Enzyme design. Structure first.
Site, PDB file in Angstrom:
ATOM      1  N   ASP A 264       0.804  -1.217   0.000  1.00 31.17           N
ATOM      2  CA  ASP A 264       0.000   0.000   0.000  1.00 31.17           C
ATOM      3  C   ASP A 264       0.839   1.270   0.000  1.00 31.17           C
ATOM      4  OD1 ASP A 264      -2.843   1.093   0.435  1.00 31.17           O
ATOM      5  OD2 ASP A 264      -1.769   2.061   2.099  1.00 31.17           O
ATOM      6  N   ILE A 265       0.456   2.261  -0.809  1.00 35.84           N
ATOM      7  CA  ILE A 265       1.185   3.531  -0.864  1.00 35.84           C
ATOM      8  C   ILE A 265       1.051   4.249   0.480  1.00 35.84           C
ATOM      9  CG2 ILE A 265       1.425   5.797  -1.965  1.00 35.84           C
ATOM     10  CD1 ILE A 265       2.012   3.809  -3.986  1.00 35.84           C
TER      11      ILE A 265
ATOM     12  N   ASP B 296      -4.568   2.750  -3.909  1.00 29.65           N
ATOM     13  CA  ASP B 296      -3.134   2.611  -3.661  1.00 29.65           C
ATOM     14  C   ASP B 296      -2.756   1.260  -3.035  1.00 29.65           C
ATOM     15  OD1 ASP B 296      -4.278   3.269  -1.133  1.00 29.65           O
ATOM     16  OD2 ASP B 296      -2.364   3.994  -0.409  1.00 29.65           O
TER      17      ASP B 296
HETATM   18  N1  DAD Z   1     -10.462   3.400  -7.040  1.00 27.91           N
HETATM   19  C1  DAD Z   1     -10.514   3.104  -5.744  1.00 27.91           C
HETATM   20  N2  DAD Z   1     -11.004   1.899  -5.371  1.00 27.91           N
HETATM   21  C2  DAD Z   1     -11.039   1.596  -4.070  1.00 27.91           C
HETATM   22  N3  DAD Z   1     -10.633   2.313  -3.028  1.00 27.91           N
HETATM   23  C3  DAD Z   1     -10.151   3.501  -3.436  1.00 27.91           C
HETATM   24  C4  DAD Z   1     -10.051   3.953  -4.728  1.00 27.91           C
HETATM   25  N4  DAD Z   1      -9.507   5.231  -4.767  1.00 27.91           N
HETATM   26  C5  DAD Z   1      -9.282   5.505  -3.506  1.00 27.91           C
HETATM   27  N5  DAD Z   1      -9.644   4.504  -2.648  1.00 27.91           N
HETATM   28  C6  DAD Z   1      -9.468   4.456  -1.200  1.00 27.91           C
HETATM   29  C7  DAD Z   1     -10.148   5.401  -0.220  1.00 27.91           C
HETATM   30  C8  DAD Z   1      -8.941   6.101   0.412  1.00 27.91           C
HETATM   31  C9  DAD Z   1      -7.875   5.009   0.393  1.00 27.91           C
HETATM   32  C10 DAD Z   1      -6.430   5.456   0.449  1.00 27.91           C
HETATM   33  O1  DAD Z   1      -6.110   5.929   1.754  1.00 27.91           O
HETATM   34  P1  DAD Z   1      -5.320   5.019   2.798  1.00 27.91           P
HETATM   35  O2  DAD Z   1      -6.314   4.490   3.761  1.00 27.91           O
HETATM   36  O3  DAD Z   1      -4.416   4.085   2.086  1.00 27.91           O
HETATM   37  O4  DAD Z   1      -4.481   6.020   3.501  1.00 27.91           O
HETATM   38  P2  DAD Z   1      -3.261   6.768   3.100  1.00 27.91           P
HETATM   39  O5  DAD Z   1      -2.700   6.153   1.866  1.00 27.91           O
HETATM   40  O6  DAD Z   1      -3.584   8.215   3.123  1.00 27.91           O
HETATM   41  O7  DAD Z   1      -2.343   6.460   4.241  1.00 27.91           O
HETATM   42  P3  DAD Z   1      -1.806   5.180   4.805  1.00 27.91           P
HETATM   43  O8  DAD Z   1      -2.058   4.083   3.831  1.00 27.91           O
HETATM   44  O9  DAD Z   1      -0.346   5.459   4.841  1.00 27.91           O
HETATM   45  O10 DAD Z   1      -2.283   5.043   6.201  1.00 27.91           O
HETATM   46  O11 DAD Z   1      -8.112   4.288  -0.845  1.00 27.91           O
HETATM   47 MG    MG Z   2      -2.173   4.006   1.645  1.00 30.32          MG
HETATM   48 ZN    ZN Z   3      -5.233   2.038   1.092  1.00 34.90          ZN
END
Ligand code: DAD
Ligand code: MG
Ligand code: ZN
Ligand code: GSP
Ligand code: FOK
Ligand code: CL
Ligand code: MG
Ligand code: ZN
Lengths: 329, 189, 188
Positions: free
Chosen positions: B20-21, B64
């Protein structure tokens, strides 16, 4: 051939008991002793505790007994109770006090386990240190079910997988897991609990809850083609209440005032007309629901039952094997 | 039949990889949606190629989050190594893409091994997926992982046959799920 | 990859499902729990056929969360209002499910609108998906929402109001990655 049967019904209807009969019939007692002693303790303290809260309040027929009452209540919430020989003496003293007994006759007005009278009538037997539980003791011992349990057995080299679930409102969310691929459903009902209410809220009539639960199962979108074998359980206690004359059925279900015994009805040898009428009335309230919808997609098979009678169960389960194998279930 | 037909099948002895990014929401909050999708596509297409080589099967992309598994479709014994190898290639890919893009791309990798139910759900827009506590754990291992490293569980290590020098992962400190479930973690070198 | 200007994204989650999911011998290692989820997702997909919902594009199913969008087909702002009508419909389907499975599952919805990029990504399969800051904020409106309520952003609150909907200020919550955002609850 392997048939998977699911046991459904409201809490305390007798499901877990039906399964015990399958063990005694087709399949570590020391572990059950503690449970029997727990039912015995829970019973005496439930009756005593309800004495002051009823309306009107029930009075002890003996001042002396008030001390045994204070004793019982003081050790009510105790976690690990060692069951001293004093405990059985006090319990037995109270159970002989008419005040306590009169309060027991009004047990429909509060929550009390079904095995109360059974265990209290034999305190001298359970108190012995060399005490060994009988078959009837194990069939009476009540213990709430939580989660699913799967039993296996054979009858003339035919396989049966029985599933026992919790009947209380919360536990029901789990039933679903057994819905797919079920041969038949055994719906148990405490026929005798018409003058009572469920533990969950302390208001809804026990029989009504059963009726609702049945109608929910009968018209379920996932059980459209699943036949239901209906155990009108607790037949013994039903007859006792009926003949007693204290709690009148028509005061809980007004429709009973219009009900008359059907012609095709088959009473048991020497059965009282009044009893015949009550049990059949209850049967029809259930049949009335099943008859409203179905169209031969699935059927309903009534059965007068008494789970604690290893003999009645042997007989009825044989009627059940016929139903299953016959209709191609 | 009253229950819809379910297209799902169980599979034992499989490995799952979650990547995950880091701070993706923060990232999309500064660069244009057009520009972001390109940087993301540059990275994920590169990942899809690596997966084919390493015998890993890509499941799906959730913005991500990127996950795949080994031991699917047909069973494999070299399974846990494939995912470790996959992560190795992945972590390197991200570096090259970060180099030529100029964007702050960093991913956490998480791996666990066990069973999974896999298939599709519903009637519309089918997409192959995986479900199980093991998959739930894998996802938590990614959350518990560390930037640019391949975080793994003890269950996974017992399938590597000792071909990788690891070190205490300390996942129970970084993620509450790992701790409460008593998971013993490790970081690959 | 086509660029859009006004698209309404929605994330409808069933937070209580994860807890309901177990892995036992009776439930066939969680297969029986997935049978119920399968029923639920199906019951939701059937709404797409209702004529009033022909403008709804089901994007995908994340776990037990249903993701959809309106506006991927372009009386101006009505598509955002249609998304709310779909969020209500999903609840009706879940209440029906509850009735037959003796459960109390409650939906938690998060809706938002703005620019997005739609298209396929990756070299394996041709799965149509959407991206953008909008999609991110939509999902945050879900993860930080409340059961049985639809959480919308301030900008979406305004639009829903011109269409005749009433909102309620949730407050000012710190959304991870975005910072302090003022959100609203749609009034049922
Ligand atoms: N096309 C998509 N399909 C599914 N989920 C999606 C899509 N685009 C965005 N998302 C989702 C909702 C927000 C999430 C990304 O945020 P995430 O929870 O990974 O946090 P973050 O990347 O800000 O920080 P971290 O992962 O470091 O805690 O991915
Ligand atoms: Mg992330
Ligand atoms: Zn995520
Ligand atoms: N007199 C009498 N008692 C019965 C009969 N059937 C069951 N009981 C008693 O009623 C009590 C409750 O039965 P039980 O089998 O525990 O209920 P259950 O349906 O399994 O209950 P639950 O687990 O859903 S909460 C037990 O004490 C049992 O012995 C019967 O036919 N007659
Ligand atoms: C359906 C039940 C269960 C337990 C099955 C499962 O493994 C998951 O679907 C994963 C892990 C799994 O499918 C991989 C994708 C993703 C999106 C990471 C899922 C979610 O976290 C699910 O939880 C939620 C909250 O939807 C979760 C955990 O739900
Ligand atoms: Cl009952
Ligand atoms: Mg029971
Ligand atoms: Zn079995």
């Amino acid at each position: 051939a392997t048939h998977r049967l699911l046991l459904l019904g409201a809490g305390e209807s007798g499901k877990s008991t039906i399964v015990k009969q399958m063990r005694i019939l087709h399949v570590e007692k020391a572990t059950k002793v503690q449970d029997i002693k727990n039912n015995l303790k829970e019973a005496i303290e439930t009756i005593v505790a309800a004495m002051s809260n009823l309306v009107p309040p029930v009075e002890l027929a003996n001042p002396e007994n008030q001390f045994r009452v204070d004793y019982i209540l003081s050790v009510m919430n105790v976690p690990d109770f060692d069951f001293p020989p004093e405990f059985y003496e006090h319990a037995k003293a109270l159970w002989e006090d008419e005040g306590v007994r009169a309060c027991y006759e009004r047990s429909n007005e509060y929550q009390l386990i079904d095995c109360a009278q059974y265990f209290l009538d034999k305190i001298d037997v359970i108190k012995q240190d060399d005490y060994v539980p009988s078959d009837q003791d194990l069939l009476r011992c009540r213990v709430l079910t939580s989660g699913i349990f799967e039993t296996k057995f054979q009858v003339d080299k035919v396989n049966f997988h029985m599933f026992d679930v919790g009947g209380q409102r919360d536990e029901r969310r789990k039933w679903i897991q057994c819905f797919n691929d079920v041969t038949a459903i055994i719906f148990v009902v405490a026929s005798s609990s018409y003058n009572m209410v469920i533990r969950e809220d302390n208001q809804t009539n026990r029989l009504q809850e059963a009726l609702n639960l049945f109608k929910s199962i009968w018209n379920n979108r996932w059980l459209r083609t699943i036949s239901v074998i209906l155990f009108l359980n607790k037949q013994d206690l039903l007859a006792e209440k009926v003949l007693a004359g204290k709690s009148k059925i028509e005061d809980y279900f007004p429709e009973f005032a219009r009900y008359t015994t059907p012609e095709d009805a088959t009473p048991e040898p020497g059965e009282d007309p009044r009893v015949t009428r009550a049990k059949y009335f209850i049967r029809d309230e259930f049949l009335r629901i099943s008859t409203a919808s179905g169209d031969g997609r699935h059927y309903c098979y009534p059965h007068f039952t008494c789970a604690v009678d290893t003999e009645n169960i042997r007989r009825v389960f044989n009627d059940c094997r016929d139903i299953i194998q016959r209709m191609h279930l | 039949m009253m229950f819809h037909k379910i297209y799902i099948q169980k599979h034992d002895n499989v490995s799952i990889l979650f990547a995950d990014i880091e701070g993706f929401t923060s990232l999309a909050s500064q660069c244009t949606a057009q520009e972001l999708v390109m940087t993301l596509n540059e990275l994920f297409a590169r990942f899809d190629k690596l997966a084919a080589e390493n015998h890993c099967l890509r499941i799906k992309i959730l913005g991500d989050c990127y996950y795949c598994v080994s031991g699917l479709p047909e069973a494999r014994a070299d399974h846990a190594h494939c995912c470790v190898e996959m992560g190795m290639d992945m972590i390197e890919a991200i570096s090259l893409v970060r180099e030529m893009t100029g964007v702050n791309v960093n991913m956490r990798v998480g791996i666990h091994s066990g069973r999974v139910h896999c298939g599709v759900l519903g009637l519309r827009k089918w997409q192959f997926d995986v479900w199980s506590n093991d998959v739930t754990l894998a996802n938590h291992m990614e959350a518990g992982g560390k930037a640019g490293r391949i975080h793994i569980t003890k269950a996974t290590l017992s399938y590597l046959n000792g071909d990788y020098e690891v070190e205490p992962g300390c996942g129970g400190e970084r993620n509450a799920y790992l701790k409460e479930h008593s998971i013993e973690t490790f970081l690959i070198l | 990859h086509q660029s859009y200007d006004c698209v309404c994204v929605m994330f409808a989650s069933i937070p209580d499902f994860k807890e309901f999911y177990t892995e036992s011998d009776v439930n066939k290692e969680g297969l029986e729990c997935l049978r119920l989820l399968n029923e639920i997702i199906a019951d939701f997909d059937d709404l797409l056929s209702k004529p009033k919902f022909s403008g709804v594009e089901k994007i995908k199913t994340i776990g037990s969360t249903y993701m959809a969008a309106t506006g991927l087909s372009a009386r101006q702002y009505m598509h955002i209002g249609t998304m709310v009508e779909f969020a209500y419909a999903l609840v009706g389907k879940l209440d029906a499910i509850n009735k037959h499975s003796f459960n109390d599952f409650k939906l938690r919805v998060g809706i938002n609108h703005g620019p997005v990029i739609a298209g396929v990504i990756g070299a394996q399969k041709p799965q149509y998906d959407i991206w953008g800051n909008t999609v991110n904020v939509a999902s945050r409106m879900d993860s930080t929402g409340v059961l049985d309520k639809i959480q919308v952003t301030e900008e979406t609150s305004l639009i829903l109001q011109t269409l005749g909907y009433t909102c309620t200020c949730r407050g000012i919550i710190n959304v991870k990655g975005k910072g302090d955002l003022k959100t609203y609850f749609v009034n049922t």
